[PDB]
Ligand binder design. Structure first.
Ligand code: OSQ
Length: 113
């Protein structure tokens, strides 16, 4: 897939996540465990992922095919469901993002083939 085609098709699905307030706020930047006072984060989360990293990968042509993008979004979600307790804002915000993403990504992936 050409990188410009992936950007054009997939960026709106990422924008849909960014638009969610308050739910996207913990996901907009890479987790900094010491700054956030969660120093065990990388012990539990082996492959961190966040919206800004995903955007950078689209912008710099790092995805060869669209399932790699879907996999990074899902990695971000699974990290949050793994690390955080079920009562936490991050956990519940993650669940909302996953609802939004599911709706956005469906027709786009059908269109890309
Ligand atoms: C992905 C990673 N995020 C954090 C996790 C735990 C603790 C903090 C974060 C985090 O990102 N802090 C930065 C923030 F900007 F989000 C601050 N702030 C904005 C308003 C809404 C809100 C809600 C909950 C926590 C903080 C927060 N667990 C995780 O799995």
């Amino acid at each position: 897939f050409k990188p410009e085609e992936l950007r054009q098709a997939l960026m709106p699905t990422l924008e849909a996540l960014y638009r969610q307030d308050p739910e996207s706020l913990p996901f907009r930047q890479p987790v900094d465990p010491q700054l956030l006072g969660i120093p065990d984060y990388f012990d539990i989360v082996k492959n961190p992922m966040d919206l800004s990293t995903i955007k950078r990968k689209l912008d710099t042509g790092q995805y060869q095919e669209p399932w790699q993008y879907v996999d990074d979004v899902w990695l971000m979600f699974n990290n949050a469901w793994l690390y955080n307790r079920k009562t936490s804002r991050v956990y519940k915000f993650c669940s909302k993002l996953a609802e939004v993403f599911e709706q956005e990504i469906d027709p786009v992936m059908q269109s890309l083939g």
